[PDB]
């Protein structure tokens, strides 16, 4: 590895051979016991330097400074052999691109820039020129590729269409970080990525790089089309719900879509179905209007293997009537009538997938993306100085709290109140006053806006974009808005206790210098925490991933009678989690019983899904015995009926699927476990009697 | 006065009512001051080379009777210049002179000296110097050293208590840290015994080391312990009373004082019972015997009857022993206090457990503890005690050590020796015994009062001192070798240790590094940096808690905002704009002094310790003309907090509000509105902005950038300005005014502008003239703009049209959307300059020839390359074309008929010579700037480099001849003036030379004086100019010294124009940075009522999501600025009279309430600023202070005055469909940022190529091959996915398998689409390694 000298090896072999031939020559010379003894200690130290170096003598290489490398460093490059073997090799066929977002094309596609194209596909292009015979000799085809001929682009198009490409981000966390897409050429040096999948990768548009790998032939492209596709795997084996992020312009666009307003334009409308084209795109009809008599057709799926149609007049808005055209077939119409936030849009896709199947929730979620970006652009949402509202009560609340704290420090000057109780007391007054400024902030956030129609006292909820983001949930939070207008709260990184000098200035107002000092203090502490949690998270995923590697999950049915009782947590006044989400799935030992006896609801083990489990929700049974892992099963692995059907495929799970590797990524799935660790009785009240 | 003649071209409008009395400092005075104090001559012996020569000198050999006295030193002028040296690419260093004198003493004869030795200077090492901009030069690089922050030497009060001890008690420790040498610390254990740890070695008791200080136990107890008195005689057994020396008691029996009981048995110990016996006069009282068993004797009392050692000091007293002692003739006995309330029985466990009672056995024991291998010989222990503890050379304190030592010990004396002393360490042990006693305050590690900064001066003094000692050893051995050495300072001093220490230090170090140059901002904020890395201050590179936090000492000196947001956070810091360094290394920040009720304009610099006690008012506060504060209760801070105080409690003032921020984040307008996190992100993103083609000064700004751009040294400024004569892009000359000049040498000042040149960041830099011609220049006026500078004002990015809207989902999260208009206006386009050099030569087969033949290649390359030389300047190099031809010799072989006819028909080079050349790898294309090549010593017969050797001569003669014309012409006109009245004739003098035959004869005096003088300075200036031209030509033709491993060095510059690109990246000043999704046509952009499509499209969701306030006010205020500039532009289109526009300009300047002293038209009103209207016609330069910036009231009033709607929202129509969007939409103009993240540079797509000889894996990126990596997380992802074949052929076939790649590739080209698992070769590497280990492994079937 050249000045070469063969460092880290020949430096040791020359010393050890030097001491060997030296001890042999002096051995033939009959050197004294001190000379041959020094030759023996330098001998054992030399062979020591060979096998294990740096443990005791720490022999240094040539340029000294850093100890020389030995066989112990040859076995483990950094930590273990993971660098050399047992972990990811550099491999081949990598784009290493930069993320961009195409709104268009398909949920599973790809934007491999042309530049990226034909560089990775060179062997397939040579073989295509061979079989098709457009070239003559191998070097002639390589010349056809290197001369940038336009004929090569057609065959390249023939290859790219059905040849899938898998994408990954370097900090891979869970199984969905690597997916399979169908590439289509777009002019540019970047890759346009599906926006709904961007949050699934967690990747951001700040310019983080991206890894592009090419699968090879049968089991790679075919197993990627039957396995690794983004639409094929939607349900995440962590939360149990399907993971899709129709946030940002989808939540804002669908929130501006679904809403009502008093008066405005259009009044009532007799026309029903095709009111969007003519009414919306022509004139006279606002995008959303209250009190619309338009009838809407319904499809009842209650029939077995058949859908029963229907039509009815339901109170709705123009935007909701436009949104209903996306909803396929037999879903009920009551799902689209709401504020339609980031939450309600989830259970829509959930019931769609668990009723109509995967394709309707794929094309349906996709059309939700299209209409969300479209009507989001047509919404014209923005933010400005006049958008936020500053309450007038903030001055009286800050002055009142300042007077109360002035009385507190007056009591401290009199000596009646201790410094600690006065400290926590002042903290309590500024906290309660902060809550007051927050509540007045909200009051002026909704009920301040007025619209004049009829008795004019009915008005309407504020249309401000900040409020549309708060209620809709596209981004932001009531706490961050409380930092925008109301008080910011108090924290101290060095001390760890609430400071006695509150921040009374809103972001719109000029902040004080020391207020900025405390804000950058706590902000620096936040950056240190968020930067610190990543290493511990990845280390935990390494430990648990190394422990969970054992599960084969081989046998189908063990047939064990032992199971774990399932009861709700019932902690505090209200129960934290209901019985449905915990009981659904897996299988039930014996059978559940009604208040009447001798009758069994289920035939021994059954798969609990939206039908059977909801049928159990209508009964009074509070406990369900459910057999699961760690109970009997096999010697190595778990039978399929103990784990349950929860997976990207909600039907069943089959022999060979390893739940151990899939595990530890649900616990280790969050990148940040906690932030600040949450800064860490005689009366009993109940919600219901 | 705000005259601003240099700023009259663009007058930036100022906001805020807070005046700044203290002007912005030069701000480079940390590096400039450290350098100018590193090279200086002073009688006081300041820290530097003189301090090192005085430290080591005199150099005396052991028993040699010879000494070496220091003549100190003097620095000379370097052989090269700054610019020319950087062009040559050699380190810039001046030789050192004034060698030290020697001395000789007569052997066996005291004071006998044969002669005094004074010798000429000898060349020793090379001392690098600093450029005027604050950089260094090594091998043609910028080489700036980052400032360092380390613990100030002195006594440290530390706690080290908490849950880490788990002993249930709070531990305490203290350690003295010298500037150099071993460390001395004390350590507690739960046994409450004071221990001593020296340089991490095992802690010995205090009694063995203090015994090694030669203090007997009597001095121990009688010194660090109390005495009092004890009286045993007459059977009364009475002691003295110390009622004020203790608060407490334990009484199981009654105690009567002078016939009355002071405290009854079981009575309260309270102050009611205390003051009863305290305030009253009481004498020594008698006690019982039982209290003696708990007491401990203090002094050492032995029996006077016989000589036994019984009743020794520091021992328990026995009731049976009292009869032996008291009856031995001892009337009084000194006993220890030994009562624990505020005190403790310290040092007793050290006396009991300490095995060594003597100083000799103590020195032997500490010697055995120092060296485990060799038993102590007792001979060198005396030298190990002094040299280890108190010695001149091995102990260093000096200015900061003794200062913080004494001040940390609360001593009166502020100065002393730089060595430790027994009473000093005894005082440290006493104060530590007080800390363990519970009284006194501890010190904080993060407190900057305990921190000190080190710079190039102190660092270079340290390394140069170490090298000087390394020389002192060999010189000491040389003088000790011979008995008598005459003319010793000749061959005894070797320059290799010096030049190796300083050249290795500035050459390679963690702190010394080259800067990546993007804008002057990154250069200045990279010039001022604080580093906790390197030697000291660095514990580990992972986790950490308290070291990375923010202490209250971070307020007015270091900027909490700017920070390395990468892996190491909170370590690298940046000094304040107004921050200054004390002579001792402490950081002082200005505070305005206040006396009584008036605020005095005197400024006082306070350190952390000085400002800790004083109370300073809040930065922003109400001020009155009389100086008194308007508000009665003014917010003020004392220590670690702030509260409302009276007007009489305020000592000082914060002056400007910019003291808490740095120069990097202080240029971000509306900082108080934007969140500190996103302001941190934007400030972190200000350094990566690449300079574009044309710079447009920011219309939303601060006004500090005016001083940053001129003080950064990037722009070309003028010295002693005057009336400009000739202007040009290459050179600028100025005729200096005659008001202030030196009477000698005459002449004018000439300037040479730097053209397009490669930087360390591979960017492009140039300077362009800001003036036309005939314009006078004052002192400090910037003549030319550097990269990303406009009219001396710093602009590192470009403004463009802004509208807030989501558009068809193309803008999502932070993604950005750019119009084709700005793409087609050439904006944001930057130039990247890469340098390619092929240097090998040095062959045992004979030297290598450059070009002149290209083997095995057609005439395509011969058309680009010259016959006798390289390619034309500014050519097109695409792909693998050969830019410079090269041929290398090969081994000789037998001739044979085949190669005989081959060499006969081929001819010339015979084609047996190799084709290896400079040819460019694939993926790199562009145009070349210049080929600098190189010249060796004694090399000829090459047509290359001749064009630059002639060009530098024609340039040096071209710009040098101007001064010759001004001198010879000026003195010639002086001859025409002196020939008057001596027989003058205008018609004859204006048509002939010699000026009347050298002014003729006339009145004799003018003949010889005027003629002989005219010849004197005529031949003096002619021959002097010719001699200077020859001396300048020799420097051009001599070249530089190349490394011996090459005959000829060739280096070529190449430049590329890269432009705004879809992937790319873009950043804001408030921290918003994203990639561009797609570049849309102009027709698709929304337009206002005037039909002006929008240039940029951003995402409004990021304001609530990422908590970014400043973007809104930036865009709206910028829209107001461009509204004013748009109206003025309309006035210029209407060609209005000067006064009509002058009124709107004046109203534009003075509108609002005060907040400036500026007045329009004040200077002549008919020019200057009148043309500055045509300068700002594009946009209005509005500035806002950091925390004093504009308010929404002035924003809506100004923007309302600009005819725009007050709400800042303009009705927009869709570009594609022409329809109107619902509700008003926010538009504006904000400052944007182009970055180095462009996808052409970042992205490299690799498929198949060369691999590594080990494991057969590819090398990695930039090698044209490599698969990046998919690691163990990807292996886990595929294992969780369930597909084992992708990992099968991914981990094996495409990586380890040698036959799997050939057979697999053959299956892809053939179309079989089949692969085999094969045997991984890396697993075989593990097999071979384990087989090399003494453990055998062999596989089975």
Author numbering:
A (entry chain D): 253 to 254, 259 to 936, 947 to 955
B (entry chain C): 1 to 1341
Please share text taken word for word from the publication where this structure appeared.
The bacterial RNAP has a core consisting of β, β′, two α, and ω subunits (Cramer, 2002, Werner and Grohmann, 2011). The major variant sigma factor (σ54) forms a class on its own and controls stress-related gene expression, including heat shock, membrane stress, and nutrient starvation genes, thus playing important roles in bacterial adaptation and pathogenicity (Buck et al., 2000). σ54 brings RNAP to the promoter DNA through binding to consensus sequences at −12 and −24 and forms a stable closed complex that rarely isomerizes to an RPo. The activator proteins, which are also known as bacterial enhancer-binding proteins (bEBPs) and consist essentially of an AAA domain, use their ATPase activity to remodel the RPc into the RPo in order for transcription initiation to proceed (Ghosh et al., 2010, Schumacher et al., 2006). In this present work, using cryoelectron microscopy (cryo-EM) and single-particle analysis, we determined the structures of the RPc containing the promoter DNA from −35 to +28 with the characteristic fork junction structure of the RPc at −12/−11 (Guo and Gralla, 1998, Morris et al., 1994) and an intermediate complex (RPi) consisting of RNAP- σ54, the AAA domain of PspF (PspF1-275) in the presence of ADP.AlFx, and the promoter DNA.
Our work presented here uses such a DNA containing a mismatch at −12/−11. The promoter DNA, although at lower resolution, is clearly visible and sits above the cleft formed between the large β and β′ subunits (also known as pincers) of RNAP. In the RPc structure, the N-terminal RI of σ54, which is the main determinant in σ54 binding to the activator protein, interacts with the ELH of σ54 RIII, and together they form a barrier blocking DNA from entering the RNAP cleft for the RNA synthesis, in agreement with the previous crystal structure of RNAP-σ54 (Yang et al., 2015). The CBD interacts with β and β′ subunits as well as the very C-terminal tail of the σ54 RpoN domain in RPc, and importantly, the CBD would block the exit for newly synthesized RNA (Yang et al., 2015). The RpoN domain directly interacts with the −24 promoter DNA. In RPc, the σ54 RIII HTH interacts with DNA around −14. In RPc, the promoter DNA is bent between −24 and −12 and there are significant distortions downstream of −12 compared to standard B-DNA. Indeed, DNA is stretched with the minor groove widened to more than 25 Å and there is no clear density for a double-stranded DNA downstream of −9, suggesting a flexible nature of downstream DNA. There are direct interactions between the RI helix and both DNA strands downstream of −12, whereas HTH interacts with one of the strands in this region. Our structure here suggests that transcription bubble formation can be at least initiated outside the RNAP cleft in the RNAP-σ54 system.
